[PDB]
Amino acid sequence: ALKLEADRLFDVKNEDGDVIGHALAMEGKVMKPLHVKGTIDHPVLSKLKFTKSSAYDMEFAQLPVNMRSEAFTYTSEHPEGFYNWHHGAVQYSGGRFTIPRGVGGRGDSGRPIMDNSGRVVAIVLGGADEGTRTALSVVTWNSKGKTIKTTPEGTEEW
Incomplete structure (x- = not known):
């Protein structure tokens, strides 16, 4: 490969x-x-x-x-579980995309979050640290193609 x-x-x-x-x-x-x-x-x-x-x-x-x-190719269906991105796994749970604390930062804005079949599920904008993890502020579209933007409390733009 x-x-x-x-x-x-x-x-x-x-x-x-x-x-x-x-x-x-x-x-x-x-x-x-x-x-x-x-x-x-x-x-x-x-x-x-x-x-x-x-x-x-x-x-x-x-x-x-x-x-x-x-x-x-985008995809609006993201069951919970694990996703891929440049620095490793991305966990989708509770409607939130999280990565380990101290991993994301400047330079990471614009980066996509993929599924195994190679489809884009979201686009990283920034992150808000919550304990042992960081909640990402992403952009995602729905099944009717509508753009949605989720931004956690105290999100810093990367």
């Missing part, structure tokens, strides 16, 4: 170039957290017209007809 995958996740860098977040190709759009102020490290995508959505901390542009195939 070699992890040969398309180009879907892109870096968003700051003025000096630090990676402060992530942008993703999904369901025909390039999307990144609105609070993430930087540029998308991509010669084509950094030149697109991004539409803003303050209510959900989302910014998005339409994917170039070409790239539209190199993208993630």
Whole structure:
């Protein structure tokens, strides 16, 4: 098994170039957290017209007809249990996505949370530490395609 995958996740860098977040190709759009102020490290995508959505901390542009195939697929069905992401397992329980305390932070915004079949279940924006864990502030859509934004008490944007 070699992890040969398309180009879907892109870096968003700051003025000096630090990676402060992530942008993703999904369901025909390039999307990144609105609070993430930087540029998308991509010669084509950094030149697109991004539409803003303050209510959900989302910014998005339409994917170039070409790239539209190199993208993630969303899913609105998330039974409880364990999910995958860049740093490991993500536990979904009580309608909340949690990761161990001291794992998430700056740079992790824009990152997706996947299921085993490789579908996106959510997009990380920030987290609120609660005891031994951290409750994530994510964006998720429902079965009727409606965007929903869950933000725990005292969530710090990553």
